[PDB]
Amino acid sequence: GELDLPERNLDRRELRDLVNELAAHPERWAEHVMHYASLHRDAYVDVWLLCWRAEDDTGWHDHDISSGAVRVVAGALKECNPRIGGEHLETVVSEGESFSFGPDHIHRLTGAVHGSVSIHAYSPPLWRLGQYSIDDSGVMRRVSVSYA
Amino acid sequence: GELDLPERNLDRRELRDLVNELAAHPERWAEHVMFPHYASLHRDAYVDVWLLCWRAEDDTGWHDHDISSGAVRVVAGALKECNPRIGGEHLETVVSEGESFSFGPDHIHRLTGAVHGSVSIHAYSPPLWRLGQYSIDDSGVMRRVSVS
Numbered sequence: 544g545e546l547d548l549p550e551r552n553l554d555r556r557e558l559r560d561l562v563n564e565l566a567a568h569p570e571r572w573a574e575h576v577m578h579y580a581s582l583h584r585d586a587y588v589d590v591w592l593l594c595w596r597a598e599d600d601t602g603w604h605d606h607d608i609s610s611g612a613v614r615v616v617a618g619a620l621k622e623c624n625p626r627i628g629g630e631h632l633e634t635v636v637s638e639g640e641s642f643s644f645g646p647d648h649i650h651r652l653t654g655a656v657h658g659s660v661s662i663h664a665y666s667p668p669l670w671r672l673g674q675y676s677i678d679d680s681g682v683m684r685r686v687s688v689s690y691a
Numbered sequence: 692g693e694l695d696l697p698e699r700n701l702d703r704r705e706l707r708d709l710v711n712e713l714a715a716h717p718e719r720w721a722e723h724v725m726f727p728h729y730a731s732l733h734r735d736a737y738v739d740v741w742l743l744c745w746r747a748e749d750d751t752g753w754h755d756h757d758i759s760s761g762a763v764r765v766v767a768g769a770l771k772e773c774n775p776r777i778g779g780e781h782l783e784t785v786v787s788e789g790e791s792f793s794f795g796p797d798h799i800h801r802l803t804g805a806v807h808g809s810v811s812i813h814a815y816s817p818p819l820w821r822l823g824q825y826s827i828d829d830s831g832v833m834r835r836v837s838v839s
């Protein structure tokens with residue numbers, strides 16, 4: 544579909560404002576709740592609606608050069624931050640709440656309440672994602688994935 | 692100088708062959724490193740080839756090459772190739788003169804601990820248009836800065 548958005552890149556605070564105001568306009572996304580749906584993709588901004596199952600897990604990833612923001616509309620999920628050593632940080636983000644991050648961010652979203660709903664926005668568009676992996680030696684790799 | 696190469700991105704083995712072939716043809720790289728020391732040997736749409744001379748304190752830091760495969764031939768001296776492990780017990784491998792190695796595009800590594808005056812040839816394909824540089828924030832949390 545398409546939202547009526549600025550023809551420029553948005554910074555982290557602008558992306559946070561965006562996902563929050565979209566949450567307040569169910570006309571923009573309620574039909575896509577019936578598991579992801581693109582609300583908007585152009586040269587500047589990508590916006591997705593995500594519907595979660597309890598087992599869903601993004602795995603560890605960066606968004607390459609994209610800033611982003613997340614708003615939980617319904618339910619709750621865990622924002623996870625990786626630490627050297629392996630005692631990663633976990634923060635429960637509950638319905639009504641949002642956060643944003645710059646393009647250096649590495650994270651993992653998991654542990655959602657069954658039926659959770661969230662809105663995610665990226666600028667510049669999320670054309671590439673870095674997905675981290677560990678082999679049986681424990682050695683870490685980053686696979687750059689195209690999501691264009 | 693132009694390189695007779697397939698007109699396409701090269702894989703890690705082909706890059707290894709290339710840096711070893713260049714190492715055996717000093718006529719092609721001695722002049723460009725004589726005076727102040729490092730030098731681009733060929734860059735085009737497909738490959739980036741560098742000659743590097745090392746100081747003992749040189750350290751690339753932890754980094755990926757985004758989507759580029761790479762290879763390294765130590766011409767003289769010695770380097771340490773380091774690979775990250777979850778937990779922080781990073782692996783280290785001394786790469787001595789005459790030895791070469793390659794890696795695919797998902798590689799995260801750090802080159803450091805060079806014998807002063809070491810000399811090496813590096814090749815990337817596709818060209819190294821972006822690097823991911825990893826760092827740790829106050830809280831121990833890891834970030835990846837994409838560098839153009």
Ligand SMILES: [Mg+2]
Nearest residue numbers: 618619637638
């Ligand atoms: Mg709650």
Ligand SMILES: [Mg+2]
Nearest residue numbers: 693694733735
């Ligand atoms: Mg050429």
Ligand SMILES: [Mn+2]
Nearest residue numbers: 604605606650
């Ligand atoms: Mn993400």
Ligand SMILES: [Mn+2]
Nearest residue numbers: 751754756800
């Ligand atoms: Mn490297």
